[PDB]
Write a protein that binds this ligand. Structure first.
Ligand SMILES: [Zn+2]
Length: 680
RNA sequence: GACGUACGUCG
RNA sequence: CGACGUACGUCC
């Protein structure tokens, strides 16, 4: 509530009617500086002119907090603040709420949707565009689209009372620049995209920064590897047997994915199996039943190989027991999903060696040196200080569950409550966690929880706690991710342990350490410039980028007027012709076919939440002998309960030429599409 | 459905 | 220098 000289010095360039980029690594300092600039911008207008400052937020956990803070702050001045969101807009007159409201905190995508639809024609209605974490203004971001609209209005010739852009952040970022010659080009490109002339950064009051932003130290502790690989050998033998079984039916299983000699347990093998699955998914034979059985067997074999490779990666990055539990969970999930000959044979071949797998996993001499060093450093830090609230980052979510189970079931360490924290992630399956559950887990992080397993969700702006220990367990990021993960240690005395087996992530961290100093030197060089030359440079860059954007403008190619039959992938059963495909909002594709209504079963959706204008109703699945394949969703548009299918889980087949093709996104699949009319 | 990041594979 | 795959995260 009391503005100090530190956070007041960052407001001097902003309180001059010029576009600035404030860079403060502090959490509360950034929002406090935004409040000070809002106060100075709403108290400087003469009598009879009101302000329409607009704060932006990319996430709901940061949007709700900023809305609460703004509502608590602008209560003694008489300023209306409501804010808009994905859930707040229950058919809300956005035009009326923007015309009546003073401080709007809508998340960007709403403003982009409004600018694309026609509501709020120009941004001249606003007078101060505040961006939170403006470093995310990368290629085709929502922030980037708002700034594209702003630059178009500025350079076209219809230049009106344009608003001020004071986009806040904590690190400008470098991207893929190697030398200082490009670390400045990237920052100038970012400043031109955000249309700013000054980079606000403290140069006088470094004492407050050094005293309240106490930063941890790096403890790169590379460890041993899987020299003891009895589990890996058994899984590799099983993978070789199932690969030979898959080659028994498919002769040419080597010229479909010509990449390199595949190696069991690597990402290369995952890419190889995905490529061979997508190549054998279109194997056509003029029988329509034997080809269907062949594609089914090949899909089952490729899925089993992918699951075995994932289990090998989990066994390499954690205990063998959790990888065996993951394999058993997959086999139990496919057990209740229909007993055909292929899955039966595979399950029998698995249970043949399941006893040896359980024995080798229960063998207490096969503990991973990664986990040994992890528990060793954990007990070391907890003996040095019993009250140390730590946080570790893990790449995979199955690996996160594995680490949680390992911290739970361990006799050596039993003073840790492994509170899981993954996030929403993909809103289609039973995985991830809800926002009200994540909020409760973060609020119980004072306290009945000390350790927690995160997947790059720990940072991302969202407020946390005073964590005095970070462990990047087989984790690696770029300069912005490293600065965000480093800033989480703010209390007096912290560490940033990095455990790994591959020297690659060590080299990445070592070059990011130099990239941070390069970004600091580039920011200093850009600050020690002149306003006129820098404005001319950013104007030249904006003109060049606008010319490139206007050049790269292709509405759509010619639509092929044919009647293709979208049919299943793993079953190859004719689902529906492309004639019965209706476009809802140039995003979603539905089917009206009465004959199609008997070719799919429905299941209760695991996580309901309405997006845009679709109530999150049931999930569809293929209806056949034994398919159980995901086909999309079945939702109510406004009053009609129609199924929206996903092209990703659908192989295309033309009746004329007879060749099969694959398409991942609906945008890529080009065909004569008619809008969805509420007639049938 | 859109967007970003990381790792990786091909020319 | 472009295409792609996986994982992760966010939004509508
Ligand atoms: Zn099917």
């Amino acid at each position: 509530f009391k503005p100090r000289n530190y956070q007041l010095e960052l407001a001097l360039p902003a309180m001059k009617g010029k576009n600035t980029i404030i860079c403060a690594p502090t959490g509360c300092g950034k929002t406090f500086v935004s409040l000070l600039i809002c106060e100075h911008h709403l108290k400087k207008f003469p009598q009879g002119q009101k302000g329409k400052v607009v704060f932006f937020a990319n996430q709901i956990p940061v949007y709700e907090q900023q809305k609460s803070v703004f509502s608590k702050y602008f209560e003694r001045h008489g300023y209306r603040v409501t804010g808009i969101s994905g859930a707040t807009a229950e058919n809300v007159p956005v035009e009326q709420i923007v015309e009546n409201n003073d401080i709007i905190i809508l998340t960007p995508q709403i403003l982009v949707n409004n600018l694309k639809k026609g509501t709020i024609p120009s941004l001249s209605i606003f007078t101060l565009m505040i961006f939170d974490e403006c470093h995310n203004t990368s290629k085709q971001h929502p922030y980037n689209m708002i700034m594209f609209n702003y630059l178009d209005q500025k350079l076209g010739g219809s230049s009106g009372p344009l608003p001020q852009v004071i986009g806040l952040t904590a690190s400008v970022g470098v991207g893929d620049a190697k030398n200082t010659d490009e670390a400045l080009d990237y920052i100038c490109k970012l400043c031109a995209s955000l249309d700013a002339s000054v980079i606000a950064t403290v140069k006088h009051n470094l004492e407050e920064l050094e005293q309240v932003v106490y930063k941890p130290q790096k403890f790169f502790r590379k460890v041993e590897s899987r020299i003891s690989d009895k589990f890996k050998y058994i899984i590799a033998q099983l993978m070789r047997d199932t690969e030979s079984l898959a080659k028994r039916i498919c002769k040419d299983l080597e010229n479909l994915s010509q990449i390199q000699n595949r190696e069991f347990g690597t990402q290369k093998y995952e890419q190889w199996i995905v490529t061979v699955q997508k190549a054998c998914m279109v194997f056509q034979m003029p029988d329509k039943d034997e080809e269907s059985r062949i594609c089914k067997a090949l899909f089952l074999y490729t899925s089993h190989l992918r699951k075995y490779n994932d289990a090998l990666i989990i066994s390499e990055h954690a205990r063998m027991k959790d990888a065996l539990d993951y394999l058993k969970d997959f086999f139990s999930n496919v057990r209740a999903a229909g007993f055909d000959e292929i899955e039966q044979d595979l399950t029998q071949r698995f249970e043949e060696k399941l006893q040896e797998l359980e024995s080798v996993s229960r063998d207490p001499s096969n503990e991973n040196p990664k986990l040994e060093d992890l528990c060793f450093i954990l007990q070391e830090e907890y003996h040095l200080n019993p009250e140390t609230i730590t946080i570790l980052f893990v790449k995979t979510r199955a690996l996160v569950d594995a680490l949680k189970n390992w911290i739970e079931g361990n006799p050596k360490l039993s003073f840790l409550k492994p509170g899981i924290l993954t996030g929403r992630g993909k809103t289609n399956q039973n995985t991830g966690m809800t926002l009200p559950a994540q909020k409760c887990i973060l609020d119980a992080f004072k306290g009945d929880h000390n350790i927690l397993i995160a997947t790059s969700v720990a940072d991302e702006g969202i407020d946390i706690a005073q964590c005095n220990l970070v462990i990047l367990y087989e984790y690696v990021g770029n300069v912005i991710k490293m600065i965000q993960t480093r800033g989480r240690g703010r209390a007096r005395g912290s560490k940033c342990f990095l455990l790994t087996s591959n020297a690659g992530v060590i080299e990445k961290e070592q070059i990011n350490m130099y990239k941070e100093k390069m970004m600091n030197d580039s920011i200093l060089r850009l600050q020690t410039w002149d306003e006129a030359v820098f404005r001319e440079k950013i104007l030249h860059i904006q003109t060049h980028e606008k010319f490139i954007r206007d050049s790269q403008e292709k509405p759509k190619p010619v639509p092929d007027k044919e009647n293709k039959k979208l049919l299943c992938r793993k079953c190859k059963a004719l689902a529906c012709y492309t004639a019965d495909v209706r476009v809802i909002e140039e995003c979603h594709y539905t089917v009206l076919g009465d004959a199609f209504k008997e070719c799919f079963v429905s299941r209760p959706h695991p996580k309901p939440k309405q997006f845009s204008s679709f109530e999150k109703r049931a999930k569809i699945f293929c209806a056949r002998q034994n398919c159980s394949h995901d086909w999309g969703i079945h939702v109510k548009y406004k009053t009609f309960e129609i199924p929206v299918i996903k092209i990703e889980s659908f192989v295309v087949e033309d009746i004329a030429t007879g060749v099969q093709t694959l398409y991942s996104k609906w945008k890529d699949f080009h065909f004569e599409k008619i809008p969805f009319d509420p007639a049938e």
